[PDB]
Design a protein around this ligand. Structure first.
Ligand SMILES: Nc1nc2c(ncn2[C@@H]2O[C@H](COP(=O)(O)OP(=O)(O)NP(=O)(O)O)[C@@H](O)[C@H]2O)c(=O)[nH]1
Ligand SMILES: [Mg+2]
Length: 164
């Protein structure tokens, strides 16, 4: 059995809490309250020859809580930086979170990038290939996800588990 600490970071309203609720509880709430104090959840997945347990910190994404984030990413072995594919500003914010992790988090941290709300592709503002290229150039594990439909939610956590 292996255990890893994972943190979710990203602009407010991109769907961080929804992503963790979908992965941990199989839930999705159309009306999810903005996170004030970082929330903690845990979930276990089954790989080829190992049981991986995730200790997950779901951080508040509003800027006024930015100064608290290092308390949650310090020592994290993995991070999922989330943006909303319908909001380019949220994608730019995600890149800045990635920069902060590369400079202040553990040098061996595994960073995944979630282009969330992919079910709203009819309102896309961030091109998939552009995000894929950005992730490849920055050594980030990228997937578009939908906490609403479950698209790639189990998949992104499992892919992270395999690389830990
Ligand atoms: N269509 C759609 N809506 C989503 C998706 N993920 C989250 N949402 C919606 O987006 C809103 C905000 O989601 P939430 O999980 O609270 O975002 P957050 O990133 O945790 N916000 P904060 O950082 O303020 O805590 C909610 O109304 C939620 O239902 C998704 O994949 N698709
Ligand atoms: Mg939240």
């Amino acid at each position: 059995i292996c255990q890893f600490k994972l943190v979710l970071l990203g602009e407010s309203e991109v769907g961080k809490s929804s992503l963790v609720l979908r992965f941990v509880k199989g839930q999705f709430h159309e009306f999810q309250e903005s996170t004030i104090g970082a929330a903690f959840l845990t979930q276990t997945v089954c790989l080829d020859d190992t049981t991986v347990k995730f200790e997950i910190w779901d951080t508040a994404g509003q800027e006024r809580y930015h100064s608290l984030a290092p308390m949650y990413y310090r020592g994290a072995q993995a991070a999922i930086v989330v943006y909303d594919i319908t909001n380019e500003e949220s994608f730019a914010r995600a890149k800045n979170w990635v920069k902060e992790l590369q400079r202040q988090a553990s040098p061996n941290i595994v960073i995944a990038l979630s282009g969330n709300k992919a079910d709203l592709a009819n309102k896309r503002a961030v091109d998939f290939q552009e995000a894929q290229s950005y992730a490849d150039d920055n050594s980030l594990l990228f997937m578009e996800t939908s906490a609403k439909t479950s698209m790639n939610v189990n998949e992104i956590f499992m892919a992270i588990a395999k690389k830990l």
